[PDB]
Amino acid sequence: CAPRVRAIVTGHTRGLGASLAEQLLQQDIAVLGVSRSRHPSLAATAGDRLVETELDLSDTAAVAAWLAGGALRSFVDGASLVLLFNNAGVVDPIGPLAAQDPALVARAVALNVAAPLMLSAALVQAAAAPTECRVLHVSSGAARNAYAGWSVYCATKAALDHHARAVALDANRALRICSVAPGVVSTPDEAARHLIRYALSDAFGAEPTADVRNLP
Amino acid sequence: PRVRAIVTGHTRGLGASLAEQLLQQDIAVLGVSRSRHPSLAATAGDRLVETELDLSDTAAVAAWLAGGALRSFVDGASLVLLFNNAGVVDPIGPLAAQDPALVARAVALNVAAPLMLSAALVQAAAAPTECRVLHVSSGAARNAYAGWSVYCATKAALDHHARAVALDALRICSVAPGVSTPDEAARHLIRYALSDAFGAEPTADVRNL
């Protein structure tokens, strides 16, 4: 007699993820919490309606292996509606390029981009008809506005926004997606010729984005 | 030489054209790809250095950047160009069709590697060396296309990375080549997620519906 509406919340042990998991369970929506640790106390309040998975979502090999296993399919089996809250994320490494550890950059991209995109695909593939899926990427104002020191975070949340825009154009069975800011935190030779000319030009860098077809 | 360039994915396509033409205008090239270019090193002499590195293996990339190869290549240069060209378009298709393992590989190659190399280049170049980072982007970074959600996401990340880096001896551009409290926030997000309007817009902000 499991709840028919169910939700997956990544990073459910603190912050927004904890508030999401707590309120979903209050409203009789089952929650699969996916985090490196467990929620301090929600299990004692919510009982077996909370399922907690210990997973490092920044380890994409571990994520793929967990997704190749049956835990997600077991959780969504028989549901009418499954919500995925892609909430887990990190803002580190903060600072300009000169301050960023490449290993921390990789970890942020894996957690903030690879895991939401992998979990979105896996949920749709685990949910058999007639289950409906709703994917909510937790985005940021930083996905749409650039901020000094936050180039890594900005990059990762911009990815989630554009993922949603493109998924929305696909022919999906029963899928809704949205990337939501929460308020808290030519030949190759021809193309190469143009890119090199632009890269060497005095004007290079005047604007942060460009398209070679606009270049005189 | 005084001007040097790093080209990822230099063994074919646009990357090969970049490497060949840079060599033609007296610029030293470090090619970084899983294998070597099929013929370039024969004609290039000491002006081409080729690193065999799987740019989708972020552990291997971090370890390579932890060594002295990049610092040794840019040592003494007056200008270093980084062409973040390597990328994959797979997996193509809707969410129901995408192998999560291939999703991970695309994000690692298309996003992690350019961002890691960009940071490492700035750190490896001592003054007064100038650095120029060019992310190879796409119209798909700015326009959405059915079937291309993974590629779209990855190139949009490169655009916004460049916008933020620009706000921080460095020039950067992402160039398409032509080919409240937590409890309150949670309350608003859950209501929105359950609402009939959910998904009508692909992006939203809790501050405005």
* 8 A C-beta contact, residue A126 and residue A73: yes
According to DSSP, the residues that pair with B205 across neighbouring strands are A181
Which phi and psi (to 5°) does residue A201 adopt?
Answer: -75, 150
Q: What's the distance, Cα to Cα, between the start and end of chain B in Å? A: 57
Contacts of B175 in chain A (CB under 8 A): 195, 198, 209-212
What is the distance between the alpha carbons of residues A93 and A169, in angstroms, rounded to a whole number? 33
Measure the CA dihedral B174/B18/B81/A150, to 10°. Answer: 20
Q: Do B62 and A173 touch (CB under 8 A)?
A: no
Query: Residue B92 to residues A170, B1, B6, B105: CA-CA distances in angstroms?
Result: 11, 41, 28, 13
Residue B130 β-bridge partners: B79
- Nearest CA distance, B92 vs chain A (angstrom): 11
d(CA A136, CA A148): 27
Closest of A138, A119, A151 to residue A181, by C-alpha: A138
Give the resolution to one decimal, in Å: 1.6
Q: Name residues whose C-beta falls within 8 Å of residue B79's C-beta, 6 or more positions apart in sequence.
A: B2, B3, B4, B129, B130, B131, B132
DSSP state at residue A212:
G
Alpha-carbon gap, residue B55 to B109, rounded angstroms: 6
Sign of CA dihedral B76, B130, B107, B29: negative
- Asked if B143 contacts A125 with a C-beta cutoff of 8 angstroms, the reply is no
B72: closest CA of chain A, how far (Å)? 18
Helices (H), A90-142: 102-109, 115-126
Please enumerate in sequence order all residues whose Cβ is within 8 A of that of B207, keeping only pairs 6 or more positions apart, or say none: A181, A183
Residues of chain A neighbouring B83 (CB-CB closer than 8 A): 195, 199
Say how far apart CA B5 and CA B129 lie, in whole Å.
Answer: 12
The yes or no reply on domain A1-216 and CATH 3.40.1170.60 is no
Chain A CB contacts of B169 under 8 Å are none
Considering CB atoms only, which of B95, B193, B204 is closest to A121? B95
User: How far is A106 from chain B, CA to nearest CA, in Å?
Assistant: 5
**How many Cβ atoms from other residues are within 10 Å of residue B42's Cβ?**
9
Q: How many CB atoms lie within 10 A of CB A42?
A: 20
Residue linked to tokens 């997956």: A8
Contact B157 A156 (CB under 8 A): yes
Q: How was this structure determined?
A: X-ray
CB-CB under 8 Å, B119 with A98: yes
Domain B1-209 fold: Rossmann fold (3.40.50)
Residue B30 to chain A, least CA–CA distance (Å): 15
Q: What is the DSSP letter of A170?
A: S
Closest by alpha carbon to A159, among A133, A135, A138? A138
